[PDB]
Amino acid sequence: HCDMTLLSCAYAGTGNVLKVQSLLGHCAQHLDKGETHQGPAVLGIAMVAMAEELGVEMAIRSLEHLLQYGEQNIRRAVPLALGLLCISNPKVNVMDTLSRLSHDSDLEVAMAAIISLGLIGAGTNNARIAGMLRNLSSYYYKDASALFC
Amino acid sequence: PYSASIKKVEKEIKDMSKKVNDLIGIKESDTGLAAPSQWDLVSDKQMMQEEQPLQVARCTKIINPNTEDAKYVINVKQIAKFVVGLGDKVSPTDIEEGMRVGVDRNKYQIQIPLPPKIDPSVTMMTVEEKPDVTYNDVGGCKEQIEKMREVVELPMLHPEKFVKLGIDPPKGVLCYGPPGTGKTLLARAVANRTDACFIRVIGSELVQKYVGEGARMVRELFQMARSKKACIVFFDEVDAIGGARFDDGVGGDNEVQRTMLEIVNQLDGFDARGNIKVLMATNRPDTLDPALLRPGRLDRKVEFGLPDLEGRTQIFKIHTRTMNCERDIRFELLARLCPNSTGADIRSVCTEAGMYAIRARRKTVTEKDFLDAVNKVIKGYQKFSATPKYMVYN
Amino acid sequence: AARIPTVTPLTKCKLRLLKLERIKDYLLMEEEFVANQERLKPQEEKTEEDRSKVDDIRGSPMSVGSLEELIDENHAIVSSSVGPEYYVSIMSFVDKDQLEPGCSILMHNKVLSVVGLLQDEVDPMVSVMKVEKAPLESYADIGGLDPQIQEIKEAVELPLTHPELYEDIGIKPPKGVILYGEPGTGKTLLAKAVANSTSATFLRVVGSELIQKYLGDGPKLVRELFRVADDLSPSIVFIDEIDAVGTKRYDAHSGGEREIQRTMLELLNQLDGFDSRGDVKVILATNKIESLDPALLRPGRIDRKIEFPLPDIKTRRRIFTIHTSKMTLSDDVNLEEFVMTKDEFSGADIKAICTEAGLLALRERRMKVTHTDFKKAKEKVMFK
Amino acid sequence: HVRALKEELQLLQEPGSYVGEVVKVMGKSKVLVKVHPEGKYVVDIDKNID
Ligand SMILES: Nc1ncnc2c1ncn2[C@@H]1O[C@H](COP(=O)(O)OP(=O)(O)OP(=O)(O)O)[C@@H](O)[C@H]1O
Numbered sequence: 001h002c003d004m005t006l007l008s009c010a011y012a013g014t015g016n017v018l019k020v021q022s023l024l025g026h027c028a029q030h031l032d033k034g035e036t037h038q039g040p041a042v043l044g045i046a047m048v049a050m051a052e053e054l055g056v057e058m059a060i061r062s063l064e065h066l067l068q069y070g071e072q073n074i075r076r077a078v079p080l081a082l083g084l085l086c087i088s089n090p091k092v093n094v095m096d097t098l099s100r101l102s103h104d105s106d107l108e109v110a111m112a113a114i115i116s117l118g119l120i121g122a123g124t125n126n127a128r129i130a131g132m133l134r135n136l137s138s139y140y141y142k143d144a145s146a147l148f149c
Numbered sequence: 150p151y152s153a154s155i156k157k158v159e160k161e162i163k164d165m166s167k168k169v170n171d172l173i174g175i176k177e178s179d180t181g182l183a184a185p186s187q188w189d190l191v192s193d194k195q196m197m198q199e200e201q202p203l204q205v206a207r208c209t210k211i212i213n214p215n216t217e218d219a220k221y222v223i224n225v226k227q228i229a230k231f232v233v234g235l236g237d238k239v240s241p242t243d244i245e246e247g248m249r250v251g252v253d254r255n256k257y258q259i260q261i262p263l264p265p266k267i268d269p270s271v272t273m274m275t276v277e278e279k280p281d282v283t284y285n286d287v288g289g290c291k292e293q294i295e296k297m298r299e300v301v302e303l304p305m306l307h308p309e310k311f312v313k314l315g316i317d318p319p320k321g322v323l324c325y326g327p328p329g330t331g332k333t334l335l336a337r338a339v340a341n342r343t344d345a346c347f348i349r350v351i352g353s354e355l356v357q358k359y360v361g362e363g364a365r366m367v368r369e370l371f372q373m374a375r376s377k378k379a380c381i382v383f384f385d386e387v388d389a390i391g392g393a394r395f396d397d398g399v400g401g402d403n404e405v406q407r408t409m410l411e412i413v414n415q416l417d418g419f420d421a422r423g424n425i426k427v428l429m430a431t432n433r434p435d436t437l438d439p440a441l442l443r444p445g446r447l448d449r450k451v452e453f454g455l456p457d458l459e460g461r462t463q464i465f466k467i468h469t470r471t472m473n474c475e476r477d478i479r480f481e482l483l484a485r486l487c488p489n490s491t492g493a494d495i496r497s498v499c500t501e502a503g504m505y506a507i508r509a510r511r512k513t514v515t516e517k518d519f520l521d522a523v524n525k526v527i528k529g530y531q532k533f534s535a536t537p538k539y540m541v542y543n
Numbered sequence: 544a545a546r547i548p549t550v551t552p553l554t555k556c557k558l559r560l561l562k563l564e565r566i567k568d569y570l571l572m573e574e575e576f577v578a579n580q581e582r583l584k585p586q587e588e589k590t591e592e593d594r595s596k597v598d599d600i601r602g603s604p605m606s607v608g609s610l611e612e613l614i615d616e617n618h619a620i621v622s623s624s625v626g627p628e629y630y631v632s633i634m635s636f637v638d639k640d641q642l643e644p645g646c647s648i649l650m651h652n653k654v655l656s657v658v659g660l661l662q663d664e665v666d667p668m669v670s671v672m673k674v675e676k677a678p679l680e681s682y683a684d685i686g687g688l689d690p691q692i693q694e695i696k697e698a699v700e701l702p703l704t705h706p707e708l709y710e711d712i713g714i715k716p717p718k719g720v721i722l723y724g725e726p727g728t729g730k731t732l733l734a735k736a737v738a739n740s741t742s743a744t745f746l747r748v749v750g751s752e753l754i755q756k757y758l759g760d761g762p763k764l765v766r767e768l769f770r771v772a773d774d775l776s777p778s779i780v781f782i783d784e785i786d787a788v789g790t791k792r793y794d795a796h797s798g799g800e801r802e803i804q805r806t807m808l809e810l811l812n813q814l815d816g817f818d819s820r821g822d823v824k825v826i827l828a829t830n831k832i833e834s835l836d837p838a839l840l841r842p843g844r845i846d847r848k849i850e851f852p853l854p855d856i857k858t859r860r861r862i863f864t865i866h867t868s869k870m871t872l873s874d875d876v877n878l879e880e881f882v883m884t885k886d887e888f889s890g891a892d893i894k895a896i897c898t899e900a901g902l903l904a905l906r907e908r909r910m911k912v913t914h915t916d917f918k919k920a921k922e923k924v925m926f927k
Numbered sequence: 928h929v930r931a932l933k934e935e936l937q938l939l940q941e942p943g944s945y946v947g948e949v950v951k952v953m954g955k956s957k958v959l960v961k962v963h964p965e966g967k968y969v970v971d972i973d974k975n976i977d
Pocket residue numbers: 286287288289290327328329330331332333334335430431432464467468491492493494496815838841843
């Protein structure tokens with residue numbers, strides 16, 4: 001965890017493709033229950049990719065692939081990483097992915113997607129984000145934590 | 150500068166992609182085989198479950214059961230008849246006499262019921278995809294549109310007024326007019342408009358070879374319709390299925406009479422079709438038999454003719470909704486320059502105007518271009534024009 | 544296979560290199576993920592153990608059946624080739640995309656479960672009408688008229704030339720072009736150029752071929768031609784000799800006039816029926832259009848009208864200079880002498896005269912053709 | 928000769944051989960031929976046939 005966090009913060013905003021590939025390879029390794037090391041790797045991938053628009057797009061595609069094939073920890077981390085990639089930039093594809101994720105059975109993934117949606121719409125006052133947040137609040141009336149998020 | 154540096158790297162990656170995909174297995178092109186990553190389930194258990202668990206249970210036809218007991222009768226169309234019984238996984242209320250079902254391949258006992266055979270001859274004749282004809286694209290027949298909707302859509306759109314009013318909704322509609330006057334262009338509209346199933350019976354799609362092999366198709370179509378909740382069966386070129394009975398001397402032109410009679414019977418009387426609305430379209434209705442056109446089977450007799458003065462303008466406005474033409478064109482002058490032309494003629498005029506404009510150099514249509522196109526489509530192609538020989542409906 | 548269709552870069556920009564590097568990285572990650580499955584739990588060869596187990600599970604002897612319905616949930620209803628209807632289910636390798644009536648479904652030999660599909664390589668109607676090779680040379684071999692060469696090009700090839708020009712104008716290609724002209728006008732010669740230049744599938748239909756002997760057959764032939772051409776690919780199907788719809792009466796067909804009428808109605812329906820035929824073009828020609836059914840010509844079924852007149856006195860020169868390109872003719876005669884020999888010498892007349900002159904030169908085994916050979920061919924051609 | 932003759936005793940004991948006419952052949956020794964009264968089917972090939 002410490003090593004990957006250091007590597008991520010070190011190369012954040014540098015766009016070095018080799019480090020992104022190394023992080024992806026680290027994520028691709030199936031790990032026994034107990035290791036939370038994948039989430040920091042995904043966040044570091046997002047941090048390295050934020051620098052370039054092409055980097056942002058390839059990171060979004062890789063995050064979609066990881067979500068399709070990722071573990072529970074990777075599934076929880078992907079919404080936060082993709083929200084980081086598109087802060088204050090409501091890209092329609094990312095918003096739709098977050099809308100799909102916010103209805104996941106796992107509550108933690110739901111709150112992660114909700115927080116990513118809030119981050120993406122921060123300061124833009126997007127009507128679509130407000131509407132989907134209203135729909136989620138209506139859905140999650142019974143859950144206190146989900147309503148809080 | 151590094152022209153060979155990038156092309157070689159790309160070629161290496163492209164070759165390696167196949168060199169690595171061949172290591173999992175997608176090759177060995179078969180003749181109807183699925184992907185090894187598509188039948189994986191049946192390897193030792195699923196195959197031993199998809200195969201060892203089940204039996205063929207060949208399907209056959211039932212005759213009737215015998216009272217005082219289960220006493221069901223087994224009958225095979227091509228194998229043999231036999232006294233058999235159903236399986237332990239069936240109910241005794243559903244013992245339909247004359248029902249297609251399979252019996253235990255060994256026990257010769259019906260273990261699974263089945264729906265009636267589809268007779269693929271009348272199963273292929275379902276729409277399954279509405280045409281791209283919308284209401285806004287069939288302008289020029291507003292009164293006919295309202296009349297057709299009152300029979301196909303309005304009665305089913307809000308089935309509360311008709312019950313409160315206390316009158317049975319009108320039964321069907323026949324659209325007979327000069328050729329090209331917009332019959333199919335509206336039938337496709339009806340298909341893409343409502344949601345109830347629409348069956349397209351091409352007037353030639355009922356004349357079978359053997360004696361009576363055609364009428365059976367009518368019964369099959371009628372059953373496939375009555376099977377669903379609500380159906381609207383649109384038959385075109387209804388002038389072919391049957392015109393009338395005129396037998397004299399040697400028996401001729403009679404077989405079509407049997408087909409027409411069978412179509413009428415399934416359409417009227419003896420527990421009629423009920424929740425099935427007919428929408429026919431003849432182009433030479435002069436020969437239609439008195440019985441078919443008699444009210445109660447095709448009550449509505451809407452007619453679709455040539456737009457007089459404003460129909461042509463509406464056709465020009467609709468069929469030209471996606472043509473790059475000069476805004477200073479006077480279409481109404483064109484609608485007045487076509488004394489008696491068909492709507493398909495208007496669409497062809499818009500097309501020819503597009504072609505002429507694209508011909509030499511222009512990028513947008515010109516009023517003079519549409520004028521020149523009219524001079525050829527109507528004033529030049531008038532030799533046949535298809536109108537004079539069918540205007541009298543004969 | 545269809546990994547990435549983005550080639551818009553078409554240059555040495557860094558975007559193309561970045562996309563290729565990302566694709567390579569994704570492929571490497573997938574390969575690494577897949578390799579560990581065998582490294583940790585191979586559990587089998589995965590190359591031949593699976594194929595052998597499939598062969599030993601599915602009935603080794605697979606029969607030639609016929610699918611007749613659709614049962615999605617591990618079931619299917621078909622008839623045994625002997626005749627007995629079967630309730631064979633779906634197997635693991637079913638790949639149920641060809642679940643249509645007629646395709647033979649291969650069942651097991653032990654339990655007769657669906658083992659394999661039946662690859663179909665027949666298409667009898669299409670084959671009895673599919674053009675294999677180009678008929679003739681380029682359009683330059685037609686010669687003389689080219690009043691329809693541009694028109695026919697716009698009607699057929701122009702849609703296939705670059706279908707954005709008609710797209711940018713906001714219209715679709717013309718419906719159909721019917722080539723009517725004097726007997727031997729070269730209409731078939733026009734289809735020759737259409738085929739030699741054509742790009743998509745083309746079907747040839749003999750005019751009498753639509754009228755069959757058994758009642759109800761002709762409509763079936765028309766519907767089958769429509770299915771074959773449309774269901775095969777974008778096509779240009781020419782039903783030559785359309786006048787044979789009712790002009791000629793034969794005793795082979797059981798039905799009388801109400802059979803040619805039914806065939807014509809079926810053809811009209813197939814041309815402008817109640818569905819989307821797709822991207823299919825029709826080019827038919829006739830020599831006696833005075834009797835053709837008026838409904839089959841209304842704008843909407845056959846749109847473009849093309850008339851072919853006899854070769855012009857100025858066009859006759861090009862026709863002659865064309866049909867005699869490779870002939871070693873002696874300079875004794877001048878073609879213009881026979882150019883006006885016939886008052887109404889059609890295009891076929893020039894070819895007949897040239898062939899007769901060649902034959903006459905052949906009878907004497909001479910090397911060139913003399914004026915007398917042409918003189919003797921002219922009388923034998925026009926005068927009979 | 929006698930050993931053969933006694934061998935034909937069991938030769939005529941085994942079941943006969945059906946007649947076949949391959950309408951279409953398939954790669955890797957696949958055969959779909961016309962059964963006399965039945966039809967066709969998918970099968971494999973023998974060990975010593977080109
Ligand atoms: N009122 C209309 N609005 C729009 N398009 C129309 C109209 N009338 C005819 N058309 C055009 O007519 C064509 C389809 O109608 P179609 O010619 O098949 O009618 P029809 O009377 O069934 O012909 P036929 O009886 O000869 O088969 C299309 O090109 C369509 O755009």
